[PDB]
């Protein structure tokens, strides 16, 4: 009916941002604004293969008017390349977006249970206490000796006591804290 026109980008700019990194649970939308006559088709692929809505929990909508696909609540399994393919009887163009998802953990730091563990050593023995911390936001770790009164020992995984003596005996604590809260585990050092 009208003058043929191969499909072309209507907002190439917006498409410059290739990688979409999103925190888990956010709704992700991809657009490939396009035009062409006769009016072109919109299809979407995930890592090369066809992408049907049953391919993921939640499925996904495609607003043909806004040349976009909308995926609610993205999760790691969703990570991958998404390609839109626009085409008509006179041409086909395409574009690919990378999608990365990161699960955010807004809790105070978590210490590995059991660590540090009690220890019994002989006078003169060197000693090491371990502490395993997990924290999305940057954790600040400190080791504390009990004298509850305390004596900061080290300030930012292991507390190292050189040529230990009886005075070295006692309770020790590994403290880790972030913007949300702080956590700690203690252990007792016995000396013989």
């Amino acid at each position: 009916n009208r003058m043929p026109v191969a499909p072309y980008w209507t907002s190439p700019e917006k498409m410059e941002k290739k990688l979409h990194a999103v925190p888990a649970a956010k709704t992700v939308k991809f657009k490939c604004p396009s035009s062409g006559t006769p009016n072109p088709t919109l299809r979407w692929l995930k890592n090369g293969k066809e992408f049907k809505p049953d391919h993921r929990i939640g499925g996904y909508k495609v607003r043909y008017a806004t040349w976009s696909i909308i995926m609610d609540s993205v999760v790691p399994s969703d990570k991958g390349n998404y390609t839109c393919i626009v085409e008509n009887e006179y041409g086909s163009i395409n574009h690919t977006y990378q999608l990365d998802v990161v699960e955010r953990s807004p809790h105070r730091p978590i210490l590995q249970a059991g660590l540090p563990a009690n220890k019994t050593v002989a006078l003169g023995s060197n000693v090491e206490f371990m502490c395993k911390v997990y924290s999305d936001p940057q954790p600040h770790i400190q080791w504390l000796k009990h004298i509850p009164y305390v004596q900061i020992l080290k300030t930012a995984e292991v507390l190292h006591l050189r040529n230990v003596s009886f005075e070295d005996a006692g309770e020790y604590t590994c403290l880790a804290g972030n913007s949300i809260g702080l956590s700690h585990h203690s252990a007792w050092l016995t000396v013989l």
Partner: protein, 131 residues
């Protein structure tokens, strides 16, 4: 949390970059050798952010301009907050009162701290693994 990361900015998809000459900007290339950062806590909530490649610290001048620092100082410490929207924001510890954010513009160019607002996409960052 001990591994180096990339601070991806949601405003244009740029990875926070600290060029060896002190230039702070963004790029869309993950193979770039200067996007890998090592964040550290000097104290609870306050962090250093330094290039693993050059060993330069991310810092903000009294103008509100991001730059690489050969050695750490008051201008290098940033307040790290995980926002409710699940993104991270980094506020200049030294210019906190004014609410000076570490941000980036639609084109990845350094965004003057005094032009950053709480509701901007420019100050929203996401930690990512190198690969």
């Amino acid at each position: 949390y001990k591994k180096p990361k990339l601070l991806y900015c949601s405003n244009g998809g740029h990875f926070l970059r600290i060029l060896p000459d002190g230039t702070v900007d963004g790029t869309r290339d993950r193979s770039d050798q200067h996007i890998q950062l090592q964040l550290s806590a000097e104290s609870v909530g306050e962090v250093y952010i330094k290039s693993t490649e050059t060993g330069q610290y991310l810092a903000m001048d009294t103008d509100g301009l991001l730059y690489g620092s050969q050695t750490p100082n008051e201008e290098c410490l940033f307040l790290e907050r995980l926002e409710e929207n699940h993104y991270n924001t980094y506020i200049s510890k030294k210019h906190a009162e004014k609410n000076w954010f570490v941000g980036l513009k639609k084109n990845g160019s350094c965004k003057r701290g005094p032009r950053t607002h709480y509701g901007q996409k420019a100050i929203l960052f996401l930690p990512l693994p190198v690969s």
